[PDB]
Amino acid sequence: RMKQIEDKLEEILSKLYHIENESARIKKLLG
Amino acid sequence: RMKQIEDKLEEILSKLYHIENESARIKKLLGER
Amino acid sequence: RMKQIEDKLEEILSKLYHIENESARIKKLLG
Amino acid sequence: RMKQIEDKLEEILSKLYHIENESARIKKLLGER
């Protein structure tokens, strides 16, 4: 139930961390 | 209900994979130009 | 309870839509 | 519990605002160069 939502949320945040590093990379590649 | 949640979380999820992809593309763009 | 999670999820996806348009913009600005 | 959820959702949330910001910055970058 709730464990299951959380667990998704833990995944989703992890995609969100990856998405930041990527943005961080692109800024560097830019200036 | 708890199943509308589940669908939306899967949808959040695909949208995440989609955006990793669009940004990877650009990173890769710039990574030659 | 659950209404409340959903409602957050509905918001979070909406930030995720905005984040795409932005990426879409940047690609355009790039090539 | 249902409160670990709430914290993480707020954290997902700030991370969203953070990334809108980092991408807006770049859009704005490129928007002159």
UniProtKB/Swiss-Prot annotation, chains A, C:
Q: What is the consequence of disrupting this locus?
A: Abolishes recruitment of the mediator complex to the upstream activating sequence (UAS) of amino-acid starvation responsive genes. Decreases RNA level of genes involved in amino acid biosynthesis and cofactor biosynthesis during amino acid starvation or methyl methanesulfonate stress. Growth dependent on amino acid supplementation. Sensitive to amino acid starvation. Sensitive to purine starvation. Decreases cellular glycogen levels during glucose starvation.
| Annotated compartments | Nucleus
Residue spans crossing the bilayer = none
The ranges of region (Leucine-zipper) come to 5-26
Q: Summarize the PTM comment.
A: Phosphorylated by the cyclin-CDK PCL5-PHO85.
- Induction context: Translation is induced by amino acid or purine starvation, or during growth in low or poor carbon sources. Translational repression during nutrient-rich conditions is dependent on four uORFs (upstream open reading frames) present in the 5'-UTR of the mRNA; these promote ribosome dissociation. Translational induction occurs in conditions reducing translation machinery efficiency, leading to ribosomes scanning over the uORFs, and increased translation of the mRNA. The rapid translational induction is followed by transcriptional induction at later time-points, independently of the uORF sequences.
Tell me the disulfide pairings in this chain.
Answer: none
Entry note about domains = Residues 89 to 100 and 106 to 125 define the N-terminal activation domain (NTAD) and the central acidic activation domain (CAAD) respectively, which can function independently to promote high-level transcription of the target genes.
Record's function text: Master transcriptional regulator that mediates the response to amino acid starvation. Binds variations of the DNA sequence 5'-ATGA[CG]TCAT-3' in canonical nucleosome-depleted 5'-positioned promoters, and also within coding sequences and 3' non-coding regions. During nutrient starvation (low or poor amino acid, carbon or purine sources), it activates genes required for amino acid biosynthesis and transport, autophagy, cofactor biosynthesis and transport, mitochondrial transport, and additional downstream transcription factors.
Q: Which family does it belong to?
A: Belongs to the bZIP family. GCN4 subfamily.
Q: How does it assemble?
A: Homodimer. Each subunit binds overlapping and non-identical half-sites that flank the central CG base-pair in the pseudo-palindromic motif 5'-ATGA[CG]TCAT-3'. Interacts with the mediator tail; the interaction with GAL11/MED15 is direct. Interacts with the SAGA histone acetyltransferase complex. Interacts with the SWI/SNF chromatin remodeling complex.
- Protein name, please? General control transcription factor GCN4
**What is the protein's species of origin?**
Saccharomyces cerevisiae (strain ATCC 204508 / S288c)
* Gene symbol of the encoding locus: GCN4
**Which stretch of the intact protein is present?**
249 to 279 of 281
